[model samples]
Target chain A: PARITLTYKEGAPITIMDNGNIDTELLVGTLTLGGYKTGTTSTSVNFTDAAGDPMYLTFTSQDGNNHQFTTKVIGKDSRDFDISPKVNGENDVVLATGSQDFFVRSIGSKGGKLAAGKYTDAVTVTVSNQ
Target chain B: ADLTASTTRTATLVEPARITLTYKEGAPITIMDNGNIDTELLVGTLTLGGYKTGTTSTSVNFTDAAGDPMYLTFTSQDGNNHQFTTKVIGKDSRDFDISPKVNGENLVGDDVVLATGSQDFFVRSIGSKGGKLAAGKYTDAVTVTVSNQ
Candidate 1:
């Protein structure tokens, strides 16, 4: 039952100013993706599996306004950044047998002229063993 | 094996940072017959606050581009030339030492990185260092530049 663990590292909510300026915020943390069953033994998992299966990362908006936010992956040496909240994007990160820090930066201009209110989104990172 | 990790992100839109100035109290400024001016006078007030969340200012400078000590150039109603040295005192949000010249020691700039939300500054004129002057109704003109550093 070994699984991937994503721990909360350090970050605060992104703040948008009244003047339509967004303060770039970071969601810093570590993604520990490990524990795959292999031939009566256990081994660490990677983003890309031998059977051609890859890890998945999905972003969902809880407020139903997905177009109000955008994010970019930084510091982890990941793949396929520039994520929009409303759609699925490919992020083929190649981390093998090691825990690495991941930085998710919320873009300012990508959010457009958001009305004076609050917004929320959920980021899901998933992986499956073959 | 299948696993997933999830987290929520939040954001809010708030007001922006601002700097303000307001007049506090004014009184008839006086000068002694021997040319000594009142050292304590309340001219105006400066409030540097309302900084946006997660954002703070670096510093604020009060200076003249010419790098000269700012003086109150007193102009008499009868064409009299009088001058007095000036100093600023910061109260409440007192961070930088304000006892020196607004420009500070010729070359050193007088800039204070604001930390607290509220600060009060009084532009006071130090006594006219032992110089005699003509007594009459007078008005002084001087300009100080303020900018972010």
Candidate 2:
């Protein structure tokens, strides 16, 4: 939306684990993306993967809440990508942009060992602007 | 020429960074009576991911909170017992290199490409013929090193 607002209910470090040395999916926080657009356009977000030698993230899909983002989640191949996000309702929204509650989580594959140390990858999500 | 939108339009926004590979327990393993435990898959568990172009390496070792000495037979994704190495988990670190009983000439370790390879290993019992391991829960950590570009 033109008037983009970011509200984070859960902030700070999102905890994760390797229980079983297997891949894990952990929901970290809930966020809201509020904004309005001038015209009708679809929205898409590209997540940047974490930084590391053997970057771990074979992004998978899943959102029990049938939102616009959830429907297209399954059968969606995010192997070459990272992170899967979902909205509460509606897939196409524009103009009078309503507040969208977001469900976001982190995924990792048990491939190469992820480099240690507190790391940060400013994942840039670009919404479609048409 | 740099063209700025005539109308006020918000640019793309970003979310926070995510962390992976934090501490956790190992998947369940079936202990066999052959002095070897079932293998904990490395590939199916978490095959390596594509990284920036650079060198690649892999290794297998174990260290418990008690620093108890142990051993395991670590193998590569496709190496025919050829890339497997069994060693004693102790203060001295063991390498990925394996010594064959015969005249085995190998160029290098399974040192495969980045983002492509699985590691698997089975815990071994001490002694030559292998005796029943002491009954108790044991935990340790395996370190995997990645060579970045």
Candidate 3:
């Protein structure tokens, strides 16, 4: 069995603010899977925060179709995701932890199912601590 | 005192000498006049002035041979008959660039290309490098390219 793993090499911590600003140093983690099978050309994965917050995620193959997908996150810190600061001078600031999950069944074109394989990659990002 | 009446005839002979006068700023003075008169001649001093007629061409020869290099001068005449021998050399006239250029090249209609999903570009001509056309014709050419990147 083979699976794909998403990893974050280096990135700043996510800043959450209802109105004010949050400043912190954080690191992004990676997700890995082994031995999965599917038959569609394109497939999407969804993610949700622990606090039940909504977020979207997208992925595209290098073939040039420019494919895309979306997901949602809830709660303070439950899923791996990109961070967005609310506004300025409010009171909804929280620190989240854990790796965000992104999964796919197939790319754009229909292909043979996966029986045994391993996939791994990294996503680089930077954050401004307000 | 005894009254005496006598009549005398006077005549004069003028040479066929030719005078070359160059005028730049003011009007020219003619030496062929029989009467003695001093008229405001050329704007400047009489660097060279003379009179000639009937096959006695002024024989005016420019120093630079460009005709454009010269100043103005006039001659005056008084009652006494007079003859003149003169040669004139004019100053070079100011030179200007009629058609300017850019980057050692001239701007033309086909020098620019229009691109899709991009902004159009344009070019304009300006005065010459030193602002002078010297003694020859100046020319320039330019090429343009358009890209989507």
Candidate 4:
């Protein structure tokens, strides 16, 4: 078991600095991502991890003045996205987790418009070992 | 990332649906069907408990500088896996593709040569016909795909 503990849930818009930085974020603000044909919004990033094998959460966005998600939202272009952790809305993608206490979010969508001049991005959720 | 000023190091995209499904307090998930597509979305029942099983995974990695490898595609016209067939009214549901690896090695384009990656799209309800359904509400609309090649 690998013992893990991280906290930042008080409306979480992401900002952790006590001496350790955090990656794989989803503080999607200004009502992020919902154009270029996508709808249904969700946002979450609960805590805890202590390993023994199995914990993989991966997603990315790069390549766009309009695609995969952008970071300059005044109209929408925070790059297109589709993350998981579900059972019925369909996109349940999880793998190996030994020392528990967790929750996966950002299982929402809404897109179909871009190039606005204020979209933003910071979507990096990489947790390994499986 | 170090007093950041690279757009705070990009990562802000949202579109989360597939409602009323919760877990990750002590890590618990087990969905099994045996004929493809194990179901587990209890609380309105999408269950299929049996025969011991457990899995949890999520992946995203970056390292490109060869042929510029970075081409990902995840479709949901309810095909090629990672399926979605819900629009907020439970009936013939299917989820779990939480097991996808493209660029981690499954060779399709640029022909295998990587730096890092892990894409798992899982969940299925095919014990016999999308397995079972028709009990209430749903909301499914998935979208994805990326590039750097």
Q: Judged by TM-score, which candidate is best?
A: 1
- Model 4, B23-123: lDDT tens per residue? 12212223345423333322122221111112111122222221112223212243323321211111111331222222343221122222222222222
| CA lDDT, candidate 4, residue A94 | 25
TM-score for the first chain of model 3? 0.24
Using all chains and alpha carbons, the TM-scores for the candidates as numbered come to 0.39, 0.28, 0.16, 0.14
Candidate ranking under TM-score, highest first, comes to: 1, 2, 3, 4
What TM-score does each model's chain B reach against the true chain B? Answer: 0.54, 0.33, 0.17, 0.17
Name the regions of candidate 2 deviating beyond 4 angstroms: A7-23, A38-97, B1-149
lDDT of 2 by residue, A1-130 (tens): 1545545444334322232122233443444545524452233432223331222212221233211110111112223322333222122223224544444444443343332223322233234443
lDDT for each residue of candidate 1 in B1-149, tens digit (9 for 90 to 100)? 55656565444543434555454645667666655666756544545444433322224334543344544334456754554455555632334444323453322234344444445556665655546655776654434333422
> For residues A5-117, what per-residue lDDT tens digits would candidate 3 score against the true structure?
33322222222222112222222222321112232111122232222223322222233443222121122223444433221111122333223322211111112221111
Among all candidates shown, the one with the greatest lDDT: 1
Error of 4 at B143 (Å): 33
Query: For every model in order, what is the iRMS?
Result: 4.1, 11.5, 61.5, 15.9
The CA lDDT at A50 in model 3 is 20
Tens-digit per-residue lDDT, A1-130, candidate 1: 5555554443554455555546555452233333323321112222221122122222333455653545454433335343221113234334434444445565554445444455554555454553
Q: What value does the lDDT take at residue A21 in candidate 2?
A: 20
lDDT of 4: 0.24
Among all windows of 10 consecutive residues in model 2 chain A, the one with the lowest summed lDDT is A66-75
True contacts kept of each: 0.72, 0.00, 0.00, 0.07
Identify the candidate with maximal DockQ.
1
Place model 1 in a CAPRI quality band.
Answer: acceptable
